[PDB]
């Protein structure tokens, strides 16, 4: 079948332009962090970090733009070489061609949906984690910062954070709905322990307010664990159940929850937009105009994505709207170029 | 079997580039379509092919108006097409090209596709190049593969675009013999060239578009009588 | 008699469509400060035009690079540079034209840092800082950490839109508020409050009751609580890339037209890449501890000359 | 007043295309250069032009080894060249095109340039197209403008690459009349083409390459009667 032909052609053009857009941004961010590696090594803020850091680019940063450019050049080959009109003059339908591209689009959605929750989150975790030589970096290793927690009615100021998951730490503002203080603690020994100790009872330095005069104090010796206490990673951190964290209480975190799970729709709509191009205003203008239109609508996708995500401030528009807006309203321009004539 | 055009029309910003072409082609004959360059041939032939849509007129196969139907629909109803430039699939085999066009034939079976492919390859002299790559072939071998691929769809009016361009007179007479082989097959052929005295000698009748008008129509000698072009 | 007015048109076009690309980059960047960096967005449209010259530092050499390359691509694929060669004209005539363009755009990049580069730099040095101090309608609830020059005073409100407050929380230890409202000019009209400052048990345990106190903690916290390389090297880019791109705008028949642009772009951005990497130690002017940059400047001038010449 | 190519040779990474070919072109005669499809019609002509670089070869105008020059140095020393396609400065006027060629005429005055321009515009009949926009010319007008640019550089041996490829047989006869007017102005004109039956009817003598080898040359009668043509 030539189903194999169109599928393997589009797939290898995807993989070639994907390796190209990985290598370019890889060496650019390599020489970008080469402007701060005066404390790391020759490769520590370099090659040992980017051999892991190539794949979060590969998930979502370039993979829609590389999706359009691959499924555009690899299907513009078939119009440059007067070869799509051959099968289209043998009777192989344009919907046959659309099904032939999207029959192998399924490994691309499968690929990025796999990597964006198996390899890329832990990839950028280990990337920021390996940058602990040159300091000031916020990672799973945080630094000496007072992380203002917010556990519902409870609140905790942090004094000091170490790298062994220990805390001269927890200062519970034990506040009820009467705003009656119950503890003024200083958890000097907050050592990491298993799931029975998501808050470990350390270093009692409290005072309850059962009376304005009588105070039951004790100088002897909340629901945010360490895998939820790492919150400075505002780009793509982890899976949906852990991202479902600020829930009994934050708009950008569920915005990123939708942006994690709409990248498959981005790739699929992106190939559909490429085929509406190759059956649209294209098919007559040459390969320079093919690749110019490619990078143009890819950059249009980038600017609409990275504005209309963070644009959710004025009305505080729903995040489904804010995340589908560079995808559904790109499906729309594709659909109009389909049914235009 | 009979393909017929009636009152063909195309314009651009109101400037008429095609004004009332009505061409016919029967099965067995080789209709030529000549003229000046860019004043009827490209646009009229490509409307009859179906690369470009019409504005006013009829395209009829055997009392069935296909003018709304696009190019792949005209191929599913019986009109074949061969492009000007090199139109082979540069990664499959010749064997896989012929089977790849035999895939969409919804009237065949497993042994029938192999049989029809071996028929076409043994008839068009590529069966020794069965396991070759079309990217790495020569011009005449590649034209054999393209004509065999066109015959794999089993057409009834193949509409050739420039077969007599860019080759020496030896390959001109070889492609002349393959068009003679197609008129032996009972398949109609519509052809547009700019080799007038190298194409008009095979056509049993030819139509001469001239800035829109078919000012000459009929046999090649009757075309050479009038010089309303010249 | 030159093609300079033909390449100047695409010069203007590529200029006009690179300024919007870099607008859409710096705007996406400063939306990061409007959302996460916690800076109020009453200054986006002002910050764009007050900072367009640090943007146009890098537009104009790449603008002439593309406006020569995309133009001579058409001039060569119409087989027309090779009809100037078919007449007695040489490669030197379009070299003369390209260096006239280099003079023009180098005047542009010079008057940039003459009358609008540092001007915008020292009016962007303020972020309209006297209105960063003077408050407006900017609250930004669930935030406002601002460790520097405030102690650790955080004051967020677990509310919906600003009518029923929960845990205004007013840090400094902390004073805790139950009810609240809002007025502008630092005077917030909150109803109740309860001050607390006890760190240890041996210290004081100070309470105040619900009072008519107005909670003035919003204070205007000010921070008081090489060009020697670029002025010559960017004019050298503008003066060099015009002479560098003409031996690379040679569009070959087989490899197509846009692949006849890959080596020019792959050398141009390798140039700016190595220049920016060699801007690692800069010392801000009077502290310049390395001059490996004129190594790559001289060797790309040599690459341009070697490229051009073919005896 | 005499051009001679001696022992031309060219390859493409071990793919030989020209193997010790020498051609002679006297002044004032339409010399052809023909052959098979892509075995030396293109390559030998582009070496005598100078676009491709040779390896071994000798090009001579009056004992001058001009084989090591660039393209325009050959154009500086009396050789003309016309490309295959639309080599018009489409955003200049025609008089500006002619003077643009005439700016490098150091052997003339500052007013004899305009005098020669008036002579060429009176000759090639562009007196109404003197100030037309160079995009907006037709086929024969465009051919006359490009030939006027060629002659404005005042050559001796002009080298045309397919001056017939893509014109109907009216403009074919007109271009033959133009080329006879060129040789009646005393120029040794060299022509390659894919059209042997169009080229051989105007050339006074022609040269037939074949696989890096001239296998015949001279008179068109002997070129009709030599080793294989039909
Ligand atoms: C075909 C036609 C061609 C088309 C045209 C071409 C288009 C080109 C586009 C370019 C436009 C923009 C130009 C540009 O970009 O321009 C420059 C670029 C030049 C080249 C561009 C032109 C190319 C050539 C021309 C083209 C030729 C072809 C770079 C720049 O600008 O340089 C720098 C910049 N690099 C880039 O931008 C790369 C560039 C790269 C550009 C690439 C171009 C590619 C083109 C490809 C062509 C293809 C053909 C070949 O662009 C980007 O990528 C952006 C994306 C661009 C993509 C656009 C789309 C492309 C489409 C193309 C087709 C259409 C970099 O950070 C950007 C990263 O952000 C994200 O990553 P993250 O998310 O962050 O990870 C991005 N992620 C992303 O985008 C997302 C994705 O990945 C990418 C997606 C992209 C789109 C994807 C799809 C594309 C479409 C595809 C379609 C097919 C990354 O992406 C990356 O990684 C790279 C990425 O993979 C690659 C990009 C991918 C592109 C792919 C394209 C493919 C196309 C193919 C088809 C065509 C990106 O790298 O750092 C700076 C900015 O940060 C600043 C700021 O200024 O804002 C400064 C900060 O300080 C930092 C620093 O970061 O440097 C951090 C510090 O922590 C620390 O580390 C410090 C030092 O290190 C310390 O040692 O440094 C800090 O400041 C202040 O903060 C605090 C303040 O608040 C006070 O409290 C202070 O304290 P603190 O709190 O502690 O910090 C600080 O003080 C510190 O220091 C003090 C001392 O040092 C004193 O010194 C003083 O003075 C100094 C000054 O003198 C210096 O001048 C300064 O140091 C200070 O002022 C300082 O005060 C100490 O004092 P002491 O105590 O010691 O006394 C003090 O204690 C403390 O330590 C300081 O004061 C802060 C802010 O100010 C806060 O207020 O942030 C920049 O410097 P600057 O801007 O110049 O300033």
Curated annotation (Swiss-Prot), chain A:
Name this polypeptide is given? Lipopolysaccharide export system permease protein LptG
- Could you tell me which InterPro entries the record lists for this protein? LptG (IPR030923), LptG/LptF_permease (IPR005495)
Listed as disulfide-bonded, the cysteine pairs are: none
Query: Which source organism?
Result: Escherichia coli (strain K12)
**Its quaternary structure?**
Component of the lipopolysaccharide transport and assembly complex. The LptBFG transporter is composed of two ATP-binding proteins (LptB) and two transmembrane proteins (LptF and LptG).
- Which ranges sit in the Periplasmic compartment? 31-58, 120-260, 318
Q: What is its main location?
A: membrane
Q: Where exactly are the transmembrane stretches of this chain? A: 10-30, 59-79, 99-119, 261-281, 297-317, 319-339
What Pfam family does this protein match (any one)? LptF_LptG
Cite a single GO BP annotation: Gram-negative-bacterium-type cell outer membrane assembly
Tell me the function of this protein: Part of the ABC transporter complex LptBFG involved in the translocation of lipopolysaccharide (LPS) from the inner membrane to the outer membrane.
What topology does the record note for this protein and the membrane? Multi-pass membrane protein
Curated annotation (Swiss-Prot), chains B, D:
**Keyword DNA-binding: yes or no?**
no
Provide the Gene Ontology terms for cellular component: ATP-binding cassette (ABC) transporter complex; cytoplasm; membrane; plasma membrane; transporter complex
Q: Which domain of life is it from?
A: Bacteria
Q: What EC number(s) does the entry state?
A: 7.5.2.-
Gene3D superfamilies for the chain: P-loop containing nucleotide triphosphate hydrolases
Q: What conditions trigger expression of this protein? A: Transcriptionally regulated by sigma-E factor.
Q: Which gene encodes it?
A: lptB
Name the SMART domains on file.
Answer: AAA (SM00382)
- Name any one GO molecular function: ATP hydrolysis activity
Q: Which residues bind ATP?
A: 35-42
Compartments where found: Cytoplasm; Cell inner membrane
The record's keywords, sorted A to Z, are:
ATP-binding, Cell inner membrane, Cell membrane, Cytoplasm, Membrane, Nucleotide-binding, Translocase, Transport
Q: Which InterPro entries match?
A: AAA+_ATPase, ABC_AA/LPS_Transport, ABC_transporter-like_ATP-bd, ABC_transporter-like_CS, BCA_ABC_TP_C, LPS_export_LptB, P-loop_NTPase
Question: What role does this protein play?
Answer: Part of the ABC transporter complex LptBFG involved in the translocation of lipopolysaccharide (LPS) from the inner membrane to the outer membrane. Probably responsible for energy coupling to the transport system.
What this protein is called in its record is Lipopolysaccharide export system ATP-binding protein LptB
Describe the outcome of a gene knockout: Results in an earlier growth arrest and onset of cell lethality.
Q: Which GO terms describe its biological process?
A: Gram-negative-bacterium-type cell outer membrane assembly; lipopolysaccharide transport; transmembrane transport
In the record, the note on similarity to other proteins reads:
Belongs to the ABC transporter superfamily. Outer membrane lipopolysaccharide export (TC 1.B.42) family.
Residues of the ABC transporter domain: 3-230
Q: How does this protein lie in the membrane?
A: Peripheral membrane protein
Upper taxonomic lineage: Bacteria, Pseudomonadati, Pseudomonadota, Gammaproteobacteria, Enterobacterales
User: How does the record describe its quaternary structure?
Assistant: Component of the lipopolysaccharide transport and assembly complex. The LptBFG transporter is composed of two ATP-binding proteins (LptB) and two transmembrane proteins (LptF and LptG).
From Swiss-Prot, chain C:
Superkingdom per UniProt: Bacteria
Localization, per the record, is: Cell inner membrane
Q: Which residues lie on this side of the membrane: Periplasmic?
A: 33-49, 118-231, 279-289
Q: What keywords are annotated for this sequence in UniProt? A: Cell inner membrane, Cell membrane, Membrane, Transmembrane, Transmembrane helix, Transport
Topological domains, Cytoplasmic: 1-11, 71-96, 253-257
Q: How does it sit in the membrane?
A: Multi-pass membrane protein
Q: Where are the transmembrane segments?
A: 12-32, 50-70, 97-117, 232-252, 258-278, 290-310
Which BP terms from GO are recorded?
Answer: Gram-negative-bacterium-type cell outer membrane assembly; lipopolysaccharide transport; transmembrane transport
A single Gene Ontology CC annotation of this entry is: membrane
Predominant location of this chain?
membrane
Asked whether the UniProt record includes Ribosomal protein among its keywords, one would answer no
Q: Which InterPro entries match?
A: LptF, LptG/LptF_permease
- Any Pfam family from its record, for instance, is LptF_LptG
Family matches, as PANTHER family: LIPOPOLYSACCHARIDE EXPORT SYSTEM PERMEASE PROTEIN LPTF (PTHR33529:SF7), SLR0882 PROTEIN-RELATED (PTHR33529)
Tell me, in a sentence or two, what this protein's role is.
Part of the ABC transporter complex LptBFG involved in the translocation of lipopolysaccharide (LPS) from the inner membrane to the outer membrane.
Indicate the family of this protein: Belongs to the LptF/LptG family.
Cross-referenced NCBIfam families, in alphabetical order? Answer: LptF_YjgP (TIGR04407)
Oligomeric form and interacting partners: Component of the lipopolysaccharide transport and assembly complex. The LptBFG transporter is composed of two ATP-binding proteins (LptB) and two transmembrane proteins (LptF and LptG).
The protein's name: Lipopolysaccharide export system permease protein LptF
Provide the species name: Escherichia coli (strain K12)
Encoding gene per record: lptF
